[PDB]
Amino acid sequence: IERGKFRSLTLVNWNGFFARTFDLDELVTTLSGGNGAGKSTTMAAFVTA
Amino acid sequence: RHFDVARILVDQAVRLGVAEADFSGLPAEWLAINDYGAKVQAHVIDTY
């Protein structure tokens, strides 16, 4: 009960993200843009964290 | 229609310059933009 939740992700001095933060949704955190927008870089930042 | 609206607006607004406060290290807040609970996180676009 009362499962813990990821609330925020932060990328510092990353290519395309100097001081970026994403507020992580409880169910659906969808990140979208043009191709090559660093989207893969965002998932990479999370996973390497 | 509001969601369909918002995307269309954003896809336009963001292309015009970028927000300078984004690099201050201070996250923007989720300003409400209508009833029913819709919110937008956005720094003020300043540098065109």
Place this chain on the structure above:
Amino acid sequence: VVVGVRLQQVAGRDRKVDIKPFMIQGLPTAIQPTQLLTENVGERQARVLP
């Protein structure tokens, strides 16, 4: 609970990277991660602190 990793581009012919994990507990709910890691120096663009 905040968790995180420091990263650094290791100089060399091969594009290497060095990583260091860390954790923080008891942080005030108000303070955002960016503030802790970034120094809002008088310059337009904030610094990132080791």
